[PDB]
Design a protein around this motif. Sequence first.
Motif, PDB file in Angstrom:
ATOM      1  N   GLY A  67       5.197  -2.144   3.397  1.00 44.18           N
ATOM      2  CA  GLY A  67       5.081  -3.264   2.710  1.00 44.18           C
ATOM      3  C   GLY A  67       4.280  -3.137   1.779  1.00 44.18           C
ATOM      4  O   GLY A  67       4.138  -2.840   0.120  1.00 44.18           O
ATOM      5  N   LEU A  69       2.997  -0.720  -2.907  1.00 45.60           N
ATOM      6  CA  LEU A  69       1.883  -1.233  -3.312  1.00 45.60           C
ATOM      7  C   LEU A  69       0.871  -0.333  -4.616  1.00 45.60           C
ATOM      8  O   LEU A  69       0.687   0.257  -5.485  1.00 45.60           O
ATOM      9  CB  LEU A  69       0.957  -2.547  -3.757  1.00 45.60           C
ATOM     10  CG  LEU A  69       2.185  -3.602  -4.231  1.00 45.60           C
ATOM     11  CD1 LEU A  69       3.402  -3.494  -2.603  1.00 45.60           C
ATOM     12  CD2 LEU A  69       1.690  -5.370  -3.234  1.00 45.60           C
ATOM     13  N   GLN A  82      -6.046 -20.197   2.035  1.00 46.85           N
ATOM     14  CA  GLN A  82      -4.464 -20.039   1.763  1.00 46.85           C
ATOM     15  C   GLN A  82      -4.252 -21.039   3.007  1.00 46.85           C
ATOM     16  O   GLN A  82      -2.977 -20.486   3.070  1.00 46.85           O
ATOM     17  CB  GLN A  82      -4.333 -18.644   1.334  1.00 46.85           C
ATOM     18  CG  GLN A  82      -4.452 -17.794   2.437  1.00 46.85           C
ATOM     19  CD  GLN A  82      -3.956 -16.284   1.043  1.00 46.85           C
ATOM     20  OE1 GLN A  82      -4.756 -16.208  -0.100  1.00 46.85           O
ATOM     21  NE2 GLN A  82      -2.741 -15.945   1.322  1.00 46.85           N
ATOM     22  N   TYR A 111      -5.206 -14.254  12.355  1.00 44.60           N
ATOM     23  CA  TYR A 111      -5.138 -13.394  11.666  1.00 44.60           C
ATOM     24  C   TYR A 111      -5.165 -11.651  12.462  1.00 44.60           C
ATOM     25  O   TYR A 111      -6.257 -11.730  12.037  1.00 44.60           O
ATOM     26  CB  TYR A 111      -4.697 -13.894  10.173  1.00 44.60           C
ATOM     27  CG  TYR A 111      -4.796 -13.250   9.203  1.00 44.60           C
ATOM     28  CD1 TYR A 111      -3.203 -13.731   8.772  1.00 44.60           C
ATOM     29  CD2 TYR A 111      -4.478 -11.384   8.491  1.00 44.60           C
ATOM     30  CE1 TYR A 111      -2.213 -13.019   7.606  1.00 44.60           C
ATOM     31  CE2 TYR A 111      -3.936 -10.980   7.377  1.00 44.60           C
ATOM     32  CZ  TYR A 111      -2.378 -11.565   7.924  1.00 44.60           C
ATOM     33  OH  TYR A 111      -1.966 -10.699   6.158  1.00 44.60           O
ATOM     34  N   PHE A 130       1.872  -6.971  -7.445  1.00 41.51           N
ATOM     35  CA  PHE A 130       2.549  -8.123  -6.083  1.00 41.51           C
ATOM     36  C   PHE A 130       4.051  -7.916  -5.090  1.00 41.51           C
ATOM     37  O   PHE A 130       4.791  -6.858  -6.128  1.00 41.51           O
ATOM     38  CB  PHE A 130       2.497  -9.299  -6.592  1.00 41.51           C
ATOM     39  CG  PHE A 130       0.810  -9.943  -6.655  1.00 41.51           C
ATOM     40  CD1 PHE A 130       0.075  -9.776  -8.030  1.00 41.51           C
ATOM     41  CD2 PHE A 130       0.363  -9.982  -5.806  1.00 41.51           C
ATOM     42  CE1 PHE A 130      -0.839 -11.034  -8.039  1.00 41.51           C
ATOM     43  CE2 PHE A 130      -1.235 -10.564  -5.925  1.00 41.51           C
ATOM     44  CZ  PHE A 130      -1.556 -10.720  -7.411  1.00 41.51           C
ATOM     45  N   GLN A 144       5.328 -16.773  -5.009  1.00 41.17           N
ATOM     46  CA  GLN A 144       3.629 -16.082  -5.359  1.00 41.17           C
ATOM     47  C   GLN A 144       3.714 -15.259  -6.395  1.00 41.17           C
ATOM     48  O   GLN A 144       2.623 -15.759  -7.259  1.00 41.17           O
ATOM     49  CB  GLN A 144       3.001 -15.502  -4.147  1.00 41.17           C
ATOM     50  CG  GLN A 144       1.531 -14.694  -3.963  1.00 41.17           C
ATOM     51  CD  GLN A 144       1.396 -13.568  -3.091  1.00 41.17           C
ATOM     52  OE1 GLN A 144       0.880 -14.702  -2.539  1.00 41.17           O
ATOM     53  NE2 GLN A 144       1.674 -12.853  -2.988  1.00 41.17           N
ATOM     54  N   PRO A 203       9.255  -4.024  -5.876  1.00 46.03           N
ATOM     55  CA  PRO A 203      10.067  -4.368  -4.711  1.00 46.03           C
ATOM     56  C   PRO A 203      10.462  -4.462  -3.675  1.00 46.03           C
ATOM     57  O   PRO A 203       9.346  -3.666  -2.886  1.00 46.03           O
ATOM     58  CB  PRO A 203      11.599  -2.919  -5.428  1.00 46.03           C
ATOM     59  CG  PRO A 203      11.047  -2.739  -6.489  1.00 46.03           C
ATOM     60  CD  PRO A 203       9.516  -2.926  -6.332  1.00 46.03           C
ATOM     61  N   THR A 204      11.051  -5.124  -3.022  1.00 41.80           N
ATOM     62  CA  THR A 204      10.434  -5.136  -0.834  1.00 41.80           C
ATOM     63  C   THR A 204      11.083  -4.128  -0.676  1.00 41.80           C
ATOM     64  O   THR A 204      12.059  -3.453  -0.898  1.00 41.80           O
ATOM     65  CB  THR A 204      11.194  -6.357  -0.961  1.00 41.80           C
ATOM     66  OG1 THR A 204      10.986  -7.918  -1.066  1.00 41.80           O
ATOM     67  CG2 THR A 204      11.454  -6.390   0.660  1.00 41.80           C
ATOM     68  N   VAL A 205      10.002  -3.316   1.289  1.00 39.50           N
ATOM     69  CA  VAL A 205      10.479  -3.121   1.156  1.00 39.50           C
ATOM     70  C   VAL A 205      10.565  -3.257   2.743  1.00 39.50           C
ATOM     71  O   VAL A 205      10.545  -4.384   2.826  1.00 39.50           O
ATOM     72  CB  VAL A 205       8.910  -2.126   1.870  1.00 39.50           C
ATOM     73  CG1 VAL A 205       8.695  -0.830   3.269  1.00 39.50           C
ATOM     74  CG2 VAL A 205       8.268  -0.531   0.708  1.00 39.50           C
ATOM     75  N   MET A 212      10.348  -5.793   5.206  1.00 44.73           N
ATOM     76  CA  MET A 212       8.901  -5.859   6.755  1.00 44.73           C
ATOM     77  C   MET A 212       8.003  -6.770   6.511  1.00 44.73           C
ATOM     78  O   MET A 212       7.740  -7.618   5.137  1.00 44.73           O
ATOM     79  CB  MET A 212       8.498  -3.952   6.062  1.00 44.73           C
ATOM     80  CG  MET A 212       9.423  -3.218   6.440  1.00 44.73           C
ATOM     81  SD  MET A 212       8.028  -2.031   6.466  1.00 44.73           S
ATOM     82  CE  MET A 212       8.736  -0.746   6.939  1.00 44.73           C
TER      83      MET A 212
HETATM   84  C1  LIG Z   1      -2.367 -12.005  -2.593  1.00 44.74           C
HETATM   85  C2  LIG Z   1      -3.579 -12.149  -1.684  1.00 44.74           C
HETATM   86  C3  LIG Z   1      -4.121 -11.381  -0.973  1.00 44.74           C
HETATM   87  C4  LIG Z   1      -4.360 -13.757  -1.795  1.00 44.74           C
HETATM   88  O1  LIG Z   1      -5.203 -14.124  -0.501  1.00 44.74           O
HETATM   89  C5  LIG Z   1      -2.386 -12.680  -0.209  1.00 44.74           C
HETATM   90  O2  LIG Z   1      -1.616 -14.083  -0.686  1.00 44.74           O
HETATM   91  C6  LIG Z   1      -1.004 -11.825  -0.088  1.00 44.74           C
HETATM   92  O3  LIG Z   1       0.046 -11.906  -0.721  1.00 44.74           O
HETATM   93  O4  LIG Z   1      -1.415 -10.771   1.372  1.00 44.74           O
HETATM   94  P1  LIG Z   1      -0.785 -10.315   2.041  1.00 44.74           P
HETATM   95  O5  LIG Z   1      -0.187 -10.044   3.109  1.00 44.74           O
HETATM   96  O6  LIG Z   1      -1.830  -9.077   2.997  1.00 44.74           O
HETATM   97  O7  LIG Z   1       0.421  -8.956   1.135  1.00 44.74           O
HETATM   98  C7  LIG Z   1      -0.556  -8.707  -0.360  1.00 44.74           C
HETATM   99  C8  LIG Z   1       0.442  -7.180  -0.811  1.00 44.74           C
HETATM  100  O8  LIG Z   1       1.655  -6.828  -0.288  1.00 44.74           O
HETATM  101  C9  LIG Z   1       2.879  -6.904  -1.179  1.00 44.74           C
HETATM  102  N1  LIG Z   1       3.923  -7.362   0.287  1.00 44.74           N
HETATM  103  C10 LIG Z   1       3.453  -7.678   1.892  1.00 44.74           C
HETATM  104  N2  LIG Z   1       4.792  -7.268   2.950  1.00 44.74           N
HETATM  105  C11 LIG Z   1       5.543  -6.293   1.866  1.00 44.74           C
HETATM  106  C12 LIG Z   1       7.099  -5.689   1.584  1.00 44.74           C
HETATM  107  N3  LIG Z   1       7.497  -5.920   2.823  1.00 44.74           N
HETATM  108  N4  LIG Z   1       7.417  -5.347   0.425  1.00 44.74           N
HETATM  109  C13 LIG Z   1       6.857  -5.424  -0.615  1.00 44.74           C
HETATM  110  N5  LIG Z   1       5.682  -6.099  -0.851  1.00 44.74           N
HETATM  111  C14 LIG Z   1       4.754  -6.438   0.406  1.00 44.74           C
HETATM  112  C15 LIG Z   1       2.713  -8.867  -0.796  1.00 44.74           C
HETATM  113  O9  LIG Z   1       3.682  -9.589  -1.422  1.00 44.74           O
HETATM  114  C16 LIG Z   1       1.205  -9.241  -1.286  1.00 44.74           C
HETATM  115  O10 LIG Z   1       1.721  -8.643  -2.954  1.00 44.74           O
END
Ligand SMILES: CC(C)(CO)[C@@H](O)C(=O)OP(=O)(O)OC[C@H]1O[C@@H](n2cnc3c(N)ncnc32)[C@H](O)[C@@H]1O
Lengths: 288, 287
Positions: free
Chosen positions: B45, B49, B71, B81, B156, B163, B184-186, B194
């Motif tokens: 995922g 990005l 957060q 984590y 993002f 978010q 887009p979401t993976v 994911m």
């Molecule tokens: C923005 C952060 C880093 C601030 O601390 C934190 O809130 C954070 O979100 O971190 P994190 O959980 O590491 O996710 C990091 C980035 O990857 C994207 N992402 C995660 N899983 C994904 C998937 N299956 N498909 C597409 N994008 C996916 C998230 O939406 C986010 O923008």
Amino acid sequence: IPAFHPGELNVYSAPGDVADVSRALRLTGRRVMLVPTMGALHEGHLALVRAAKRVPGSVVVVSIFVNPMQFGAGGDLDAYPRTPDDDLAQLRAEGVEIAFTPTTAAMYPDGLRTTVQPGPLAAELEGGPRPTHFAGVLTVVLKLLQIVRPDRVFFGEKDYQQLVLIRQLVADFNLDVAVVGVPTVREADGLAMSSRNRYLDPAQRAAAVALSAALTAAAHAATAGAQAALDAARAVLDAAPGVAVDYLELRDIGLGPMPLNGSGRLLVAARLGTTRLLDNIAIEIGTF
Amino acid sequence: AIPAFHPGELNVYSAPGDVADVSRALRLTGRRVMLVPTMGALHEGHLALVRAAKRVPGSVVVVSIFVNPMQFGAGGDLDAYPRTPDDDLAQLRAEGVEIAFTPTTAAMYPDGLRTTVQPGPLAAELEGGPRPTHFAGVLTVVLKLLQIVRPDRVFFGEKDYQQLVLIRQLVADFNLDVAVVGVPTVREADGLAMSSRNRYLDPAQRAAAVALSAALTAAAHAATAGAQAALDAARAVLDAAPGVAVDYLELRDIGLGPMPLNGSGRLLVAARLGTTRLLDNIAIEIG
Ligand SMILES: CC(C)(CO)[C@@H](O)C(=O)OP(=O)(O)OC[C@H]1O[C@@H](n2cnc3c(N)ncnc32)[C@H](O)[C@@H]1O
Ligand SMILES: CC(C)(CO)[C@@H](O)C(=O)OP(=O)(O)OC[C@H]1O[C@@H](n2cnc3c(N)ncnc32)[C@H](O)[C@@H]1O
Ligand SMILES: [Mn+2]
């Protein structure tokens, strides 16, 4: 990029316009200086302008925006003095090339949505009975810094708590800008210059000298300690006709969760009629 | 002297000042700085990005890895984590990323929590219901990351749609000069979005979890018959799954404002399978 005529006062209302001109200038090598103000300019404001102007290769941007968010109520906002024409004539006289005059709608098209939450200092001193005041200030200053993106931003020591909070803002959000504090400009008798001095009648104007006299008395009495400095200031304020002290406090220079140890700041706020005046001064305890 | 930068290689910096200097220097040499914020424990995922950022002509990709304590909730488990540094940097190297920013908590928060970002009201809804302070933590760190790296674009995932919307609000409201790119979401082969949390699901829960994506895609197609039909189709699919405790299922406009009876929108869902909270969302066209 909108028209920009060097060596002349260029006025932009659109954030987008000043942002494009500023970047364009930055890209050519000029260093952009920002002086935030709410208008009704006087010599205090001009010392900031002049400080910005002496920076080599600088282009000075002065913002004039009476920020609604830092006002506690509609009444104070409507009562703030506004002298647009005099303000721009003074800017022109100072050789300022950019005045940024945004509308409330261009600055808050979505009303109060994402905002800046200041640290604990914002709930003290001036923020005590005005809990949203500093959030209003930091929110607009953050926006102004992002729109203009200056190398340096100037603030007066007159509003010392505001200056300290802006340094926190810059540090805490990793803003890439140097914060320049400018010493307080005073009338010939010591009265700190302020747009609110126009609300003092002849008698009050004469009594208002007690704030600066109390502070400078305190600064010299300080060789004998904190108590001596505080009591000297208090004796001067107590001998002043029609002066109601709001607060008189001695604090560490950073105003933070630290005890006063040697170098500090003495701050006072008092009312003369309906006019609330403020003043502060650097203080060294034990130092001559 | 600007810190060292070796093109074509993964360059790791922990000091904010260092990555800031390299970023500004690279910008001047003709590179478009792309920022991809993450909290590590990278998976496909996250890499989508990375790949999105990498395809921008002249790009230099900056991937931040920082488990943001602000957060996590007064009840969120910060120490629990996942932390796999070595592996993360390996995946970045494999993707051709040239810069990884790995600051310490002390370097990101040298003065503790002092000035912070207060999100608008959307932060108190949906995910904000159970964790009212989560988004202030997110916007605060993202704002700091944007000022340190000063990227031309920040990426993002649509996975965390709320978010994403709140970051667009942060960028608009503070007049930040950066383009926000939603990716887009993976998804796994059966549609499950994911997440590192999926490995916490036992077989029964993993099988039941497919209902979240199945309900959303059903809704997306049931939407030609209207909003209510889309919502009822989604609810029926979730209702056919055992052990799936739905916290919310809401159709909103794309900015997460009030539900549309016509036009574009987003359908979001969150549910608990045992102790694991899962989220999903999808674009919806009503009518
Ligand atoms: C923005 C952060 C880093 C601030 O601390 C934190 O809130 C954070 O979100 O971190 P994190 O959980 O590491 O996710 C990091 C980035 O990857 C994207 N992402 C995660 N899983 C994904 C998937 N299956 N498909 C597409 N994008 C996916 C998230 O939406 C986010 O923008
Ligand atoms: C930062 C603003 C513009 C945000 O709206 C607003 O809060 C604001 O402060 O406006 P304003 O009251 O217009 O003051 C603008 C700036 O001029 C400085 N200043 C005022 N009187 C001064 C004096 N006598 N000597 C030296 N500097 C003096 C202030 O400290 C402040 O930085
Ligand atoms: Mn006049």
